[PDB]
C-alpha cells in the first residue's frame, strides 16, 4: 500500500483493495481493521484524486456493513465525512455526520464520537453558523474530557477550539492560548498542520494590537 501510494500507482489500488477482501475475512477482524485504516489513510492522503475518492469509500462502506464490520464502517464514514468537508460538500457532510452521531449514540464509542463532533463543528463553522459550531465544539469538549486525548486528537481539538473562540471577536487571549496548546501538540507529534496553528498563533497577537 505504501509503495503503491507514494509512487502514484493508486489507480491500481482500485483492484488491490478488492483483491484482499477475502484475505481480510480469513484473518482476525481487528487485523483487517488496522490494514484497512492504513490503506485508506495512505490513499486519501496524497493527490490521487482520480475519479474514485468517495466511490471506493462508498463500496467499502457497503462491504463493511454487509460483513457486519460495523465499527470499521463508522470509522470509514468518519473519514468520508472528513473528505466531504475537504471537498466543500458541507450539506452531505452534515447529513453523514448527523447519522454517524446517531449510531455512535446508540453505542458509547466516545473515542470516535469526539472526532465526529469535531468534524460537525468544523463544517458548521464553514457554513457561518457560529452557534451550532460552538455547541458541537462544547459537546466534543466534554466528550474528550471523559477520556485522555492523544496528542493528535488533542491538537486538533485545541485548534478548532481556538478557531471557534476567534470566530467570536470578543476575546483573543484565550484563543491565543488555545492555539499555543494546539501548536505545542502538533510539534510534539511533528504533524505538518503545526505551521497552520503557528500562523493562527501570530494572528491572535496581531489581533491583540500588540505585534
Amino acid at each position: 500500500g505504501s509503495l503503491l501510494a507514494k509512487t502514484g500507482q493508486a489507480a491500481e489500488l482500485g483492484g488491490l483493495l478488492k483483491y484482499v477482501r477475502p484475505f481480510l475475512n480469513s484473518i482476525s477482524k481487528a487485523k483487517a481493521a488496522r490494514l484497512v485504516r492504513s490503506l485508506l489513510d495512505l490513499f486519501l492522503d496524497m493527490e490521487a484524486a482520480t475519479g474514485q475518492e468517495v466511490e471506493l469509500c462508498l463500496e467499502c462502506i457497503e462491504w463493511a456493513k454487509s460483513e457486519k464490520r460495523t465499527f470499521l464502517r463508522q470509522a470509514l464514514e468518519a473519514r468520508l465525512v472528513s473528505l466531504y468537508f475537504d471537498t466543500k460538500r458541507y450539506q452531505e457532510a452534515l447529513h453523514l455526520g448527523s447519522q454517524l452521531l446517531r449510531e455512535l449514540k446508540k453505542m458509547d464509542d466516545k473515542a470516535l464520537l469526539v472526532e465526529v463532533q469535531l468534524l460537525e463543528s468544523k463544517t458548521y463553522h464553514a457554513l457561518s453558523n457560529l452557534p451550532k459550531a460552538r455547541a458541537a465544539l462544547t459537546s466534543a469538549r466534554t466528550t474528550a474530557n471523559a477520556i485522555y486525548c492523544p496528542p493528535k486528537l488533542q491538537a486538533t481539538l485545541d485548534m478548532q477550539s481556538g478557531i471557534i473562540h476567534a470566530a467570536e471577536e470578543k476575546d483573543w487571549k484565550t484563543a491565543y492560548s488555545y492555539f499555543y496548546e494546539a501548536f505545542e501538540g502538533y510539534d510534539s507529534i511533528d504533524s505538518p498542520k503545526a505551521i497552520t496553528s503557528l500562523k493562527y498563533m501570530l494572528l491572535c497577537k496581531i489581533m491583540l494590537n500588540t505585534p
Binding site: N145, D158, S177, Y178, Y180, E184
Partner: protein
C-alpha cells in the same frame, strides 16, 4: 447522635432544596473535592441542573493563570 444529626442535616438540606417556593430566584451551588461520593439523592436531576468540573490547571491553563496574576 452525631451520625443521626448529620443525616437529618442532609435530609433538611434536600427538603429545603425542593421546598424553596417558585418565583424565588435563589441559586444553590455546592463545592466538592471528590464528587465520586455525594448521595445520588442530592445528585437527583430534579434539583441538579449542571455538574461542573474544576481539575488541576494543566499546560495552557497554568500559563494563563500565571500571566493573569503576573
Amino acid at each position: 447522635g452525631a451520625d443521626r444529626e448529620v443525616q437529618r442535616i442532609l435530609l433538611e438540606l434536600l427538603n429545603q432544596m425542593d421546598g424553596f417556593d417558585q418565583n424565588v430566584n435563589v441559586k444553590v451551588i455546592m463545592a466538592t473535592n471528590r464528587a465520586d461520593t455525594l448521595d445520588p439523592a442530592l445528585l437527583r436531576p430534579g434539583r441538579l441542573d449542571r455538574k461542573i468540573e474544576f481539575p488541576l490547571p494543566d499546560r495552557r491553563q497554568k500559563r494563563l493563570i500565571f500571566s493573569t496574576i503576573t
